[PDB]
Amino acid sequence: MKFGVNYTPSGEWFYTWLNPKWEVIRRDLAQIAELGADHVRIFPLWTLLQPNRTWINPKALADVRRMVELGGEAGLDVYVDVIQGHLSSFDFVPSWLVSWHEGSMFTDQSAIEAQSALTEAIYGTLSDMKAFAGLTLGNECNQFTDATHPRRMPANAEQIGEWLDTLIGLVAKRCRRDGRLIAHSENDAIWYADGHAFLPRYASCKGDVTTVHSWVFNGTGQHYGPMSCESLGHAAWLVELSKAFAADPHRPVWVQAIGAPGNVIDSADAPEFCRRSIDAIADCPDVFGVTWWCSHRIPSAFSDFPFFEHQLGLFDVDGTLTDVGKAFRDAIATHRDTVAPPRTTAIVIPVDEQGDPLMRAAQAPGGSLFEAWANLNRQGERPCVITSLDAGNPAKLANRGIVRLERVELVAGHAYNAVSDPAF
Amino acid sequence: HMKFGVNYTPSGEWFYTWLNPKWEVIRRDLAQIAELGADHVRIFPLWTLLQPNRTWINPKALADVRRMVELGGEAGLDVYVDVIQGHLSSFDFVPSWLVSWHEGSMFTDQSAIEAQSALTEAIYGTLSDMKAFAGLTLGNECNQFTDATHPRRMPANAEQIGEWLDTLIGLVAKRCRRDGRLIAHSENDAIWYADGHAFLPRYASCKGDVTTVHSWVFNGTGQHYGPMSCESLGHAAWLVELSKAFAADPHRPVWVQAIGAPGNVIDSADAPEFCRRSIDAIADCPDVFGVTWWCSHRIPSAFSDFPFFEHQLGLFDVDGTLTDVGKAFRDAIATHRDTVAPPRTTAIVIPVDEQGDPLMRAAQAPGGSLFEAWANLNRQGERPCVITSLDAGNPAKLANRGIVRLERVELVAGHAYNAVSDPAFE
Ligand SMILES: CC(=O)N[C@@H]1[C@@H](O)[C@H](O)[C@@H](CO)O[C@H]1O
Ligand SMILES: CC(=O)N[C@@H]1[C@@H](O)[C@H](O)[C@@H](CO)O[C@H]1O
Numbered sequence A: 001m002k003f004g005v006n007y008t009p010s011g012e013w014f015y016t017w018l019n020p021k022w023e024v025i026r027r028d029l030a031q032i033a034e035l036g037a038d039h040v041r042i043f044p045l046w047t048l049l050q051p052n053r054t055w056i057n058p059k060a061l062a063d064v065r066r067m068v069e070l071g072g073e074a075g076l077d078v079y080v081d082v083i084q085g086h087l088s089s090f091d092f093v094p095s096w097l098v099s100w101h102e103g104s105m106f107t108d109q110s111a112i113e114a115q116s117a118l119t120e121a122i123y124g125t126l127s128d129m130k131a132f133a134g135l136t137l138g139n140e141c142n143q144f145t146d147a148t149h150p151r152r153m154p155a156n157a158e159q160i161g162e163w164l165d166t167l168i169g170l171v172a173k174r175c176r177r178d179g180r181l182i183a184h185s186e187n188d189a190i191w192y193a194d195g196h197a198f199l200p201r202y203a204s205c206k207g208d209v210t211t212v213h214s215w216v217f218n219g220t221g222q223h224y225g226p227m228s229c230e231s232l233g234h235a236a237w238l239v240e241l242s243k244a245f246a247a248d249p250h251r252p253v254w255v256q257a258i259g260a261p262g263n264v265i266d267s268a269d270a271p272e273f274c275r276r277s278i279d280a281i282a283d284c285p286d287v288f289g290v291t292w293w294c295s296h297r298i299p300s301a302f303s304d305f306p307f308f309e310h311q312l313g314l315f316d317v318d319g320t321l322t323d324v325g326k327a328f329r330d331a332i333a334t335h336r337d338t339v340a341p342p343r344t345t346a347i348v349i350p351v352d353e354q355g356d357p358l359m360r361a362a363q364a365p366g367g368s369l370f371e372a373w374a375n376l377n378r379q380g381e382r383p384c385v386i387t388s389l390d391a392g393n394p395a396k397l398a399n400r401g402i403v404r405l406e407r408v409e410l411v412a413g414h415a416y417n418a419v420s421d422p423a424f
Numbered sequence B: 001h002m003k004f005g006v007n008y009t010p011s012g013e014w015f016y017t018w019l020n021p022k023w024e025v026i027r028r029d030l031a032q033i034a035e036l037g038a039d040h041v042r043i044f045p046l047w048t049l050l051q052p053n054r055t056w057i058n059p060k061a062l063a064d065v066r067r068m069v070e071l072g073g074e075a076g077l078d079v080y081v082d083v084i085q086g087h088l089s090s091f092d093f094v095p096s097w098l099v100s101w102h103e104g105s106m107f108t109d110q111s112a113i114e115a116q117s118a119l120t121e122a123i124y125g126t127l128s129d130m131k132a133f134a135g136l137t138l139g140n141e142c143n144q145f146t147d148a149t150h151p152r153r154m155p156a157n158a159e160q161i162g163e164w165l166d167t168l169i170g171l172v173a174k175r176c177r178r179d180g181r182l183i184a185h186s187e188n189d190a191i192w193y194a195d196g197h198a199f200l201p202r203y204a205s206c207k208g209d210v211t212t213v214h215s216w217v218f219n220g221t222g223q224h225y226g227p228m229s230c231e232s233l234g235h236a237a238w239l240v241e242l243s244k245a246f247a248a249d250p251h252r253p254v255w256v257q258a259i260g261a262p263g264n265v266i267d268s269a270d271a272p273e274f275c276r277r278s279i280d281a282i283a284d285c286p287d288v289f290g291v292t293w294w295c296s297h298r299i300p301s302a303f304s305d306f307p308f309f310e311h312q313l314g315l316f317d318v319d320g321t322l323t324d325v326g327k328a329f330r331d332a333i334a335t336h337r338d339t340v341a342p343p344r345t346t347a348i349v350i351p352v353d354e355q356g357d358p359l360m361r362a363a364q365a366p367g368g369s370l371f372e373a374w375a376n377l378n379r380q381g382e383r384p385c386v387i388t389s390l391d392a393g394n395p396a397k398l399a400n401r402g403i404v405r406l407e408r409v410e411l412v413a414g415h416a417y418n419a420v421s422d423p424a425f426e
Helices: A013-018 A022-035 A058-073 A109-126 A157-178 A200-205 A220-224 A234-244 A270-282 A307-311 A323-334 A368-378 A394-399 B014-019 B023-035 B059-074 B110-127 B158-179 B201-206 B235-244 B271-283 B308-312 B324-335 B369-379 B395-400
Strands: A002-006 A039-042 A077-081 A132-136 A181-183 A210-214 A253-258 A287-292 A345-349 A384-387 A404-406 B003-007 B040-043 B078-084 B133-139 B182-184 B211-215 B254-259 B288-293 B346-350 B385-388 B405-407
Touching: A002 A022, A002 A323, A022 A058, A022 A323, A039 A058, A039 A287, A058 A077, A058 A109, A109 A132, A109 A157, A132 A157, A157 A181, A157 A200, A200 A210, A200 A234, A210 A234, A234 A253, A234 A270, A234 A368, A234 A384, A270 A287, A270 A323, A345 A368, B003 B078, B003 B324, B023 B059, B040 B059, B040 B288, B059 B078, B059 B110, B078 B110, B110 B133, B110 B158, B133 B158, B158 B182, B158 B201, B201 B211, B201 B235, B211 B235, B235 B254, B235 B271, B235 B369, B235 B385, B271 B288, B271 B324, B346 B369
Parallel strands: A002 A039, A002 A287, A039 A077, A077 A132, A132 A181, A210 A253, A253 A287, A345 A384, A345 A404, B003 B040, B003 B288, B040 B078, B078 B133, B133 B182, B211 B254, B254 B288, B346 B385, B346 B405
Antiparallel strands: none
């Protein structure tokens, strides 16, 4: 299992992409490596990368390479997210896709070519880099197609599947030959939102690894309590849930983002949330890695962020180590060698003829399946999660080593909140 | 006398060069504009780069604007800066803190007015010590964001729009007068042609130091009357003369801040004549502050989603060579560097409410009765000006403007006006 942090540049956040202070970035990545992390995740801005649909900015590509270079010289593997897209409640969409040029990145064919050219351009610029570990198509891109988005980019579930297949397929074989990974990222709506065009099986079958972003402001922390077994184990629950919709029985699961948000978790307890959540993740088999959010706190001078976003960094505004920064550093040591035994008792999830849930609000906070797992795990049963389709096929049940099943009737939860802050 | 300049579109990477300016090319760019006979340039920083967060202005972006002003001055050109873009050639550049999850109106959101206030002062503060910094415009055609046609409209009533203009202009207005610079604001022709538009005609002609007007004959004039009609060729002069009626100062200068020969309505073979005869029409109107053509350098062929006609608007080709219109504009600078315009004596009355605004704005719009009454008067060689009904009942203002003849016409709405450059935007 791997340990890393999502890199928020100190001093100027992602606005530093306009004019990177490379000596500060070098000091930033050196601090992350000093925690014991082995990798880092970085976020270029789509508006700077591709200011026109048919012109990618060479300076922005070169600046991404420099950060990849500096990350490696600190001893860190660097994972790059291509399309931002969305970052901490803000949207950075190039001018050729807004207002007079409004379009859907998921259905507009010429916009798919632009995303296609940018993905190849990012990989081509970094192909020679030894620390270039892999690509994610973009941070939580599905938020653009959800109905909660104030400028939704429309798309049905089939178009979303073709969207993933097009971009992932461009660089999938280069990634395999080169020894790198290609993956995609979605917020918890893919697991929790009924009617969502991103289906759970997309995250667990498309791409090389399943990415998961565990945030307990989604309803789990207010419904059950900031440090309930439901909340502290939410990251583990997302790990075990995602496996049910995967075809590969030992597919790695990467918790690509997880933090202790101040809006539901208190600062005095935030270190305990870090340690125990990682204890929960460390008990699940086949975890690719744990990437914390985030590296360095957002400067106090920047505005319109949700308040809790300013304290998410592992290093404070003056560069000193945070209380959670000591918890994440100590957790890296505690779990660098811990291996997780196979999980024997599975929770059955009733699913479509094609692998999709009947009622996703039952896997959502407050739902029966959600609570059945938390209750089973709380009692030390280390449960996994299976679908109804796999439950009637002894081959897959054998490959995964399940010997005990659990049927639970579906009751919808109502605690899920699709937005970080009430203002949205 | 009147000034001649060019709107500066950076060659090679358009306004995308702001991401990483090639200063040696920009230096060569401004050298070409000066060689035409131009005395000034209008430059356009991008709001998304200037102010990536509501409470943080990027020092690198401020310094890049300063370097461009410096290169313009070392080229011998006065530099006019537009603060808020905003809108440029059918594209919107709105920062992330004013979009989607942070959607807001730049005209009514108090914190967005403070942010625009900080950027306006920062731009002026950064450039105040520089000799070639000639003045500020609040932004290129900012009214298009509040128009009812806008797909992401930032709403505002006419009273709120007045407060927006009064807040930003008043910030640097007193500094501008002692420092010897001008402060102004810009609106597209919807302020003159669109009924119900929250930007009123008297805003453009009373607020700021000079009246700005952007003359584009794809607004319906070239399609209705013909690309090389007197309605089309005199549209810029008509926009000058129309704006004066709503001005309180009888000799306030009018700045045709942008004018081009758009290829979607004018044929390339005719664009040089359109340049010459339109500037001839402007040169005959009194108190023309200047004529600023659009634009300097054509957009490179590789850039996409522009309306096709935009690629050929530049005075210099993609390889730096001068276009036929570039030779027409250069020839016009020489032809009218010394020509002064006699007073215009015959005025057209604009029926107006009790508070200075037209009864029917669509009647001065293309296809309207006031519009054609002036075009017909100008076609007959009568050199007409434009007055309001209120000024017609005040012999002092008529005396101050030297008017001796009136021409009253009934209000008939036009139906030729087009609020968008391309059919794709309807
Ligand atoms: C507009 C908004 O609230 N966006 C947030 C996003 O920043 C966050 O990464 C995600 C985590 O689940 O939750 C979304 O609601
Ligand atoms: C959406 C659109 O076409 N907007 C154009 C704008 O780009 C142009 O600068 C202006 C000139 O008057 O005319 C508007 O209609």
